[PDB]
C-alpha cells in the first residue's frame, strides 16, 4: 500500500504545516501537524476542556462506530517550545492520503496549553519519530507509520515541504519526479528516539565549506533551524546590523537586509537553503526588526534541522530495519 497527502503552511511565514487526516467511521477530517520529532497522535476532541478550544475541529469518538476506549490508558506530553497536552486514548481507523491503519491509538486531549488553544489552524499532532518516545501509559502505543510499515510497498515516508506553498507527505514510495539529482542517504541513530543524523558541515552564502560534524534531528514539527552558536554567529555576521537580542529571544536583523543562503552537508552532497527561507518577518507588526530563521541550539541540548532546512530538500525517512535519512535537492 501507499498514501499521499498534501501538506499546507498554516500562515504566510510557514510557521507550521497541516495535513488532512481522516479519523473514525464515518470519517472525521482533522488537520494535523505531522511531527517527525515526536511520536504521539493526539487531537482536539469532544473531551477537551471547553475553555481551551478556540476554532479547532474536534474529534468526537462517540460519533465513530469504530472508536474503542483504550481502557486505562492516558498520555501527557511536553514539547521543546514549552507547550503541552494530555488526556485519554481511543483506538480507531486513521487514514492519510488513502493509506488506512486500523486500531491506531488516537490520543484524545482533555487539556491543552495556551499555545495550542491560540492556534486555530492545528487540530492536533501526528507523530512520526520512533515509537519509543510515545507517551501513552501504561501500554506504550505505536505511531501511524509504525503501524502502517509492514503493509507499505517500501517501509518509508517522505517529506517534501514547500516554501510559502503546499507540499507533500508520501508513505510507502519515493516519487522520483519530486527531486533533482540523486538522493544522498546518511546514517541514523535511534538511541534518543529521533531521526538523528550527522551533517558533514556548512557554508554561509558563497563562502567556503567548513567540514565539521553537526549532530542533529530531522524535525518537521520545529519551524526553524537550530545549530551550534559558533555556526549561527558565523551566519549572522554576514548580515549587516544583525544581532542576538535577549529581549526578543534570538537573532534579529534589519528588515532592509538581503540574507545570504546557508548550505548544509549530507555526506558529500550539499543542500542549499536560499536566504529568503531564513526571513521570518517583523518581530511585531510594523517593526523594521525581522526575526531570523537560523537560531542557536545552545540550551536546547540538541541541534534541530527544522522546517527551514527540510523545506529546501526532498527528505526520505527510511524505516527499514536499519533506519536511514535521505536528502535530495529539488
Curated annotation (Swiss-Prot):
- The EC number(s) given in the record are 3.4.23.22
- Enzyme class per UniProt: hydrolase
The catalytic site is made up of 35, 199
What biological process terms from GO does the record include?
proteolysis
| One term of GO molecular function | aspartic-type endopeptidase activity
> Its catalytic activity?
Hydrolysis of proteins with specificity similar to that of pepsin A, prefers hydrophobic residues at P1 and P1', but does not cleave 14-Ala-|-Leu-15 in the B chain of insulin or Z-Glu-Tyr. Clots milk
Residues forming the Peptidase A1 domain are: 17-328
- Keywords assigned: Aspartyl protease, Disulfide bond, Hydrolase, Protease, Signal, Zymogen
Source superkingdom: Eukaryota
- Cystine residue pairs: 255-290
Q: Which family does it belong to?
A: Belongs to the peptidase A1 family.
Record-given protein name: Endothiapepsin
Gene name in the database record: EAPA
Full protein: residues contained: 90 to 419 of 419
Amino acid at each position: 500500500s501507499t498514501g499521499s497527502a498534501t501538506t499546507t503552511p498554516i500562515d504566510s511565514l510557514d510557521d507550521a504545516y497541516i495535513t488532512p487526516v481522516q479519523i473514525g467511521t464515518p470519517a472525521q477530517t482533522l488537520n494535523l501537524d505531522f511531527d517527525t520529532g515526536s511520536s504521539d497522535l493526539w487531537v482536539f476532541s469532544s473531551e477537551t476542556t471547553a475553555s481551551e478550544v478556540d476554532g479547532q475541529t474536534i474529534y468526537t469518538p462517540s460519533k465513530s462506530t469504530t472508536a474503542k476506549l483504550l481502557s486505562g490508558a492516558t498520555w501527557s506530553i511536553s514539547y521543546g517550545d514549552g507547550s503541552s497536552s494530555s488526556g485519554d486514548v481511543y483506538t480507531d481507523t486513521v487514514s492519510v492520503g488513502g493509506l488506512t491503519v486500523t486500531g491506531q491509538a488516537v490520543e484524545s486531549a482533555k487539556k491543552v496549553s495556551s499555545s495550542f488553544t491560540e492556534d486555530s489552524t492545528i487540530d492536533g499532532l501526528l507523530g512520526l519519530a520512533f515509537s519509543t518516545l510515545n507517551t501513552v501509559s501504561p501500554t506504550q502505543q505505536k505511531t501511524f507509520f509504525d503501524n502502517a510499515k509492514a503493509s507499505l510497498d517500501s517501509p518509508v515516508f517522505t517529506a517534501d515541504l514547500g516554501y510559502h506553498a503546499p507540499g507533500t507527505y508520501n508513505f510507502g514510495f519515493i516519487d522520483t519526479t519530486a527531486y533533482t539529482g540523486s538522493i544522498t542517504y546518511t546514517a541514523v541513530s535511534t538511541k534518543q528516539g529521533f531521526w538523528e543524523w550527522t551533517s558533514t558541515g556548512y557554508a554561509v552564502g558563497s563562502g567556503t565549506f567548513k567540514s565539521t560534524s553537526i549532530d542533529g534531528i530531522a524535525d518537521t514539527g520545529t519551524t526553524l533551524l537550530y545549530l551550534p552558536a559558533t555556526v549561527v554567529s558565523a551566519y549572522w555576521a554576514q548580515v549587516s546590523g544583525a544581532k542576538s537580542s535577549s529581549s526578543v529571544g534570538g537573532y534579529v536583523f534589519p528588515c532592509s537586509a538581503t540574507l545570504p543562503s546557508f548550505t548544509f552537508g549530507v555526506g558529500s552532497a550539499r543542500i542549499v537553503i536560499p536566504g529568503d527561507y531564513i526571513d521570518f518577518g517583523p518581530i511585531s507588526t510594523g517593526s523594521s526588526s525581522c526575526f531570523g530563521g537560523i537560531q542557536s541550539s545552545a540550551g536546547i541540548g540538541i541541534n534541530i534541522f527544522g522546517d527551514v532546512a527540510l523545506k529546501a530538500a526532498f527528505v526520505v525517512f527510511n524505516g527499514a530495519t536499519t533506519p536511514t535519512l535521505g536528502f535530495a535537492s529539488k
